[PDB]
C-alpha cells in the first residue's frame, strides 16, 4: 500500500533525473541472465523506463529462457557473454592490477573475469555500465564479495545493509541489516552516517538512535558500544541529532523520549535506527514484516563507491523491482556528484 | 487482545473454585506506589488475589486516601520489622547467604527491605506470590527473588512476553534477564517457554532464532543449531528447530517451500532469541511500530510465584502481571499438593 | 600509641585557631548508630568538628536519650527529604548519572539514602566532610562517595593504614579498594600515600612490595618495578624503589648488605602492595599477631574529605576517622583557597 | 622461642635412639661456606647429623682450618667428579631429563654442580637429606632438588614457615614456591601443612585466607572457598574453613561472634595463602615489625628430605633448617621401611 | 627419478592384472585444459585408468583436435546437467549440506560445477577417483572434495610430498592444508604418511620436526613431543619420534652420537612439520637449490580417492598425480572388499 | 664453496695490513676443547687472530702437549679468577644486571664462568671478539653474550647462515635466535642481513618468505608483507619484497613469468624467515639432503664481535666462525673510530 506510494514516488524521481540528462536511462547489469525472478521483473522494469538492462550469459540460453517463460518486452534487450566482450582482456588486466598483492595471479584473474558477478562489477567500475543487481541465487556474502573487491568502498565508508520501514506518513531507516555481524562503536557511527545521507536524499532531517537493551546506561558491553558510537557520530557530523544508548521504543516514540529522558538530544522521535549486531537487526525487521502488519522494503547496499545492490535469495519479484529502482537512483546521484 | 486477559481471569476463578473459593495471597513490596494502588482497585473486584501491601500503614493509608480509592480500605498491610516472623526470616536469609558475604547484621538490614521481605514471605508460605519492581530497575528487583526464592532444578531465570494475534499467540524469550545465553541456556529457556504454552493446551513449536537459515556457521548460527539439538534431546516429543530466521520461523508457508526437511511444521509459537539485544529490540519494535498487542514480561524458572514489573509499567500492565502471578501460584500450589 | 591521636587532635586545634575558631562540618549518615553517637560524645568535647546527623529528628533524639548521652541534645540533625536543597540535590545527582542508568525518579529515591545525601552535602558545600559505613559493607558505603564527590584529577581511591611504632609510623596502601592495581595505579597510590606522610613533616620513603628483590621478572615483579619507575618520573625528588621484598623494605640493614644500589635509604615508611590479598592479610596479621597498633583505614584520592568506617569498627576507630576527616577537610579548605 | 628448637632436638635424639643411635647423613653443597661451617660446629655437638661437605678437600680443609673450628676436622668431604658413583649419577640424571633438553654432556656439566650432586646423592640413598642454596637465589637452588628428587605422588613443592608464639605456633604456606596456586593446589598445600602439624601432636585447624569473609565472590574468594571444600573432602576429620580474612582466621573470638556457622572453632594454626605475593609479604612483615620468632622456610612435598636456605639466613637459621631436615629424613625413612 | 613413476605404474598394472584387468575410473573436471589433455595423451598409452572428462562435448572435442592429440578421440565426456544421475546428485548434495547453509536451488547451481560433480561422481561410485584444480587455487579446489567426499573416521586432510633420493625416498607432510596443526592433528598426519610408506614395503620411520632436540619446551617443542606420544599410543608398532631437529631426523649419525635414547633408528623417511610455513618453505627450497627430485603434493585423509593439482602444475605433475590417484583408488576398493 | 672461506681470509689480511698488521684478539672460553685447539692450529698459521684461551694454564698446556700441536705452545692463556681485572669485571656485570635479579655474589659466581668472562673481556676492550659454546646449547651460550655485550641501537640478535652456491650465495636469517619475529623484527633482521651482503660488495635483494605468493592474508602472509613494507621505508634503495614463496624468491624466472609487478628482479640473496621452525628446518634440510655447502650460523646484531658455535660443529666449522669473528671485529673497529 504505502510501498506502492513509495516505489511510485521513487520511479517518478527516476524519470525526473532521466530528464535533465537528455532522456538517457541508466545501464544496469544483471549477472543472472537466466534467473526466473530476474527476467519476470525485467518485464515490469522496461515499461517503467527505469533502466537499460544488460543480461550476462550466453545469448542462446537467455533467449531460450526468455522464450520459455513467455515474456514479450525482452526481445531487444542487450545481452553479453563475459569472455566474449571487446573489453574483456583489459578488465582482466585491471583486476590483476587491483588484487595482485591479495593473492590473485594473472590466470586466476581471467578465470574470475569469466564469472558474471566479477564481470558485472568490473563493468560498473570501468564505466561501461552504471549499476548492478546480483545475488538472487547465491548467498549475500558470496554475492557482495566481487562488488567489494572490484568496486570497493569510498574513504571511511563501510559496506552496510539498509532497510526501509514504510509507515502511513513517514518512513524509518534500519541499518545494518546484512553485512557486519558485530560492528564496533567506530563502525556503528559510520553506518549511522551512511543511513543519514540516504535520509537527506529524500529531503528529510535525519534523526539517529543507537539502539541497545538499555536506556542511557553505558554499562560495559553493548550499552557502552552504542553510547560511544553516538559520541563518535556527533563528533564526525555536529549538525545532526545522534543519540544512544537507548531502547527502541524510546527511539521511535517522541513522547517516551520527552517524558523520561528530557536531557536527550534526540527530539521528535528517530527515523534512523542503528543496531548493535546482525542478530538484532535481521530479526527485528523480519518480525516487523511478519507480525506487525507493516511495510518493509530493502535491503539496499550502502558504503560502496559505485551503484550496486545485492538481492536476497528469498527475494520476491517486486523485491527485484524495488532493488533495481534504488540501484538506478543511486547510479544517477553518483553521476551528479562526479560532475561536481 | 483484551479477550486473552479476560480468559485468564476466568481460569483463575476456575482454579479458585475447586479450591474452596480461596484466592492466592500476592504481596506487593511497593505499598506506597501510585500505580500499584490504582491497579489494586481493579484487582480485588475481579477476585484475583488477597493483596498484601508492605510499608508503614500510616504512609500507605495516606497514599491510599490521597489518590481517593474506596475499595481498598481493609486490605492487608504489613511492615516487615513488626511482623511476628521477622526475626525467623532473618535467620533463614542468614542461613541462605552466610557463605555469600552476608553477616547477621546485613541480613537484618536486608530483611527490612520490602523486596527481600516479600520474597521471604513467598519462600516461607506466608504468601503465595509477589509482584515487585515498579520503582527500581529489573536487575535490582529480580535479585532478592533469585537469592531468596531461587531457581528450580535445571532452571534459568528468563523473561517471557506474549505477542497476541487475533487467532493465536506467540511467546518471546528471553526478553529481560540473560545478556548472551549459551546453547545450553537457550535450550532451557526454550523448554520453560514450551511449558507455559502447554498450560494453555497449545502444542509448543519452538524456533531458535538467528540471522541465518540452517547455516550452522560459526557464531550465533552454530549456537542456535546446538540449542535446538540440546532441547530436542531433552524433550523428543516437541517440535524444536534451528538455526533459522524469524520469517522462516513464524510463516509455515516459507518453511514448507524453502526448508521441507525442517522438523518445525505449522509456524512457531515459541521464539528463542540469541541475545538480549535482539529480543528487547524486537518486541519493543513490534509494539511501537506494529499494531500488535504485547503483554508481559513474565518471569519463568523460579521455584515460587514471583513476577517483576518493568519500571515503565502501565496500570493494566500491573493487572496482567498479577493475573499470571496468581495463575502461576495456583499451578505451583497444585504441583506441590501432588508432591 | 595514643600519642599519635593527641598530636593529630592538637593539629586540628592549630588550624581552627588559625582560621577564626571555626570547626569543619562533618555529616554522619547513620545518625542512630550506637557506636557513632558514643564517639561523638568524645569528639564534641574535643572541639574537633561541627557534627551533622542524618535521620528523622525523633529517632535520633530517642537513641540519644536511650544511650544516656547528655552532650548531644543540641547537635544539628537533618532529615534528607526535608532539607531545602533536597530537590536541587536530586537534580545534581541526576545531572551526574543521567547517562549512567539513573532516571529522575531514581535520583530522588537515592537522594533519600543518607549516604547519597551526605555525599551531596559535601560536594555542594553544605558540609566539609563526611564519615559513613558503620552499618554497610565497604563497597556499598564508598559507592555514593565515588559517584557524587569523585576523585581529583589523575587520582585513584585507595585505603590507607598507619602502623604506629615507637619513633615513627608506616603507611600501608592500598588496603581497601583496588583488587589488583596496575603499575600505573600503584605509582599513583604511592604518590597519594607520600603526600599524607609529607603532611606529618616526615620525608617520604616509598617501597613497592613484591615477592622478589629487584628481579623485574614477568608478573608482579615487573609490575612493581615499573610502578616505581612511573612514580619516580612524576616526582623525581622522592625516594621510591621496587620491586623488593618486605624485609628489604623496612629493614635498612638488609638493604645495606645485599642491595646497596637501591635508592631507598633508611627503611621505608610507605609500603605499596601489589594486590588486595597481600595488603589486607598483611595489616590484619600485624594487628592480631604482634602487639603493634594499626589505625585506619582512611580513604585517599577523593576530591573532598570523606572516610568510610569498617562495619565492625570500634568507637576509637570512629574517633580516628573523624580526626582524619577533620584534618583532611582542613587541608582541602587551605588548598581550595588558592 | 628457643623452646621449639630444643624440643625439636629432643625428638631428633629420640628418633636416633630406637634406631641404633645412628644419625642422618646430610650433604651440604656449599662445603667452603663460612656460615655453614659455623653452624655445623654447633650442629655436631648436638649430634644431629653426619655432615657431608662437597668441594675440593684441600680447599675445604683449609677453610675449616682458617676459621678456627675444632669439631669439624674429621667430617666427611666429597669431591663430586672424584666419587666412585659420579658417572652413574650422570647416567641417572641423563635418564631423567633427556627428553627435557639435557643430553649426556649437559648431564656431565650439571652433575659437577654440587647442588645437583647433592640431590642425586640423596635420591640414590648415598645420603638421607640435603640443605643447599646458602649462596644462590631460591628458585635456582630449589631447581636441582625438584629435577632430581621430585615430588611424591600428588604432592606439590611448597614452602612452610612457623610463627612461634609462647603458647602455640602458626604454620604459613606456601611462602616460597607457588606464585598463584589453583584451588586444588591450595588444598594440597593445606594437606601438606596439616601433616607437619600432626607430627608435633597438635590438632590441625586450617584456614584458607582471602581479603573476604565467606563471600565466595569471583576471584580469589571463590578460589579459596573452593580450595577449602577440596581439602575438606580429602581430610574430613580436620577443621578446614574458608574463604576468610586473617584476623577471622587466627582470632577465635571473632570467628565465634561474627561467623558462628563456621566449622573452624578455636582459632587457626594452618594459614594457607592465595598467592606468593601475600604469603611472602605477610611473613616477612610479621618478622620485621612484630615481636614474633619466625623460622623456616622448610620445603614440603618432595619425595626425600631436602631444604633450601634463604639468602638472608642467619647461622642459627642453618641450625634450624638442618634440625628439620633431620626430622624429615628420619620420618621419611621410617615411612619407607613400613 | 623416473624409476619411481615406473615402479608405481607397474604396481597399477599388477593390481589390475589381479582384479580382472579393469582400470579405475578417474574424472577430470577441467576437460578442456591444455595441460590436462596433454598428460592424458601420455596416460592412455600406459593403461592407468579410464579417463572421464567433464565439459561440453563440443568444446572438448574442439580442443582435442586443436591441440593435435590423436589418441583421445573416444574418451568418455560428460556434461553435468546432462548426466542421468544429475538430479539425484543434486538431491544428495542437498542432503549433506542443508543444515550448512545450502538450499535446494544452491545445490543445483553447485552440482553444475564440474568440481562438485566430479566429487559426487566419486562419492556415489560413478567413478573411483578424480584429479582437479589445475586452474584454481588449492583451497577452492579441495573444498568440494571435503564437502562431498569427506574424511574417513579421525582422518584429517593433509598434503604430502615425496623427496626422491636415489637409494630411498622421504615423505613430507602436511605441505598443503593445515596452517598450524595441533599435536593430535600432527599425530594423525604422521599416521597417514606412515600408511603410504608401508604401502611401498618400506618400514616407516617418522620424525616430528622442530627447531629443538628433545627439549619439549613450551611451544613447538612441547607440541611435537606430545604429537609423537599421541601417535605412538595409537600405533605402538611404528618408529615415531620427536621433538627433534631436522638433521637429527635425517642424519642417523647425528642421532647416534648425540641422542642414543631416541626411538628413531636409521634416519627418518617421514618428516612431519609443525606448521605450513616450515613445510612449504622447506620442500620448495629442497626443490630449487638442493639438486633433489620432489613430486607431489598428493592429498591424504579422504574417504575416496581424489587429488588436487597446484594451479602452477606441470604436465608430468598431472601424470604422477593420476598414477597416485589410481593406486589410491585400487587400494581403497580392496579395503572396501575387506 | 672453499673459495669463499679463502677469499674471506684475504680480507682479514688486507684489513690488518691496513692497520699496522695487528690481528684481532679473539678469546675462546673452551680452552681445553680438542676441536677448538685443533682449529686454532689451522687458524694460527693463517695469521687470522691472536687467540686467548681460558682455563687453568696448567691443564691447557698439558692438553696442547698431549694433543701434540706445536704451533700453540706460546699462545695467550688466562685463568679468569686470576686476572687483575676479574673483580672489576664482576662489578660491571653487577652494574648491568643488578635490577634483573643478580646481586654481587651471583655476579661473582657468573664471572667465574668462562663464557661470561669472555663476554666481559670483549665489552671492556681486553679482547675484540669471542667464539664460544661448542659444548652447550645455543640459548645458554648466547645468553651471556647478550647480557654483557648487548645489542647495538635498534639492532636485534639474529643468526645468519650462508648457502654457498658456485656463482653466488644466499643469506638465510634468522636461523638461531628469534622464535616468532614480529613484522618490525623481521624487517630489522632483513636490514642486518642486507648490511653483511653489502660488506661483500653484492647488491642485496631481500625476499620475505611465507607459504603464500603475494596474498597478504591474515597470519604469516600479512606479517611478511608488512615486514617487507617496513624494511622498504627504512632502506628505500633496496629491493625488498614479500610475502612470497621460497621458489618465487630464489628463482628469477618464476618471479618474471608469474609476478612481473614484483619489485624483486634477478633472484633473491637475502631470505627472511617467518619463524624459527621454518628457518632452522630449512637450512638443515638444505645441508643434509640438498648437499649444498652451507656455513654458519653467525650472530648479527650485537655491539661487539661474538659468535656461538653449534654443538654439532666441525673443526673447519670453528675455523669459519673464527674467520668471520675476526672480520666482524675489524669492521666494528673501523666504525668506532669515526
Author numbering:
A (entry chain D): 437 to 776
B (entry chain C): 439 to 777
C (entry chain B), D (entry chain A), E (entry chain E), F (entry chain F): 439 to 776
Study authors write:
Bacterial hybrid malic enzymes (MaeB grouping, multidomain) catalyse the transformation of malate to pyruvate, and are a major contributor to cellular reducing power and carbon flux. Distinct from other malic enzyme subtypes, the hybrid enzymes are regulated by acetyl-CoA, a molecular indicator of the metabolic state of the cell. The larger ME isoforms (hybrid enzymes) are predicted to be a fusion of two unrelated enzymes; a catalytic N-terminal ME subunit and a C-terminal phosphotransacetylase (PTA) domain. The PTA domain is homologous to PTA enzymes (that interconvert acetyl-CoA and phosphate to CoA and acetyl phosphate), yet they appear to lack critical catalytic residues and thus acts as a sensor instead.
As a control to mitigate any local/biased effects introduced by 3′ loop mutation, we designed a different unbound variant by mutation at the opposite end of the binding site—a N718D mutant repels ligand at the acetyl group. Supportively, N718D protein purifies without bound ligand and is also insensitive to inhibition. Interestingly, the N718D variant had increased activity compared to wt MaeB, indicative of release from inhibitor suppression. We were also able to generate structures for R535E, R535A and N718D PTA domain variants, which demonstrate the same features as the wt PTAapo structure.
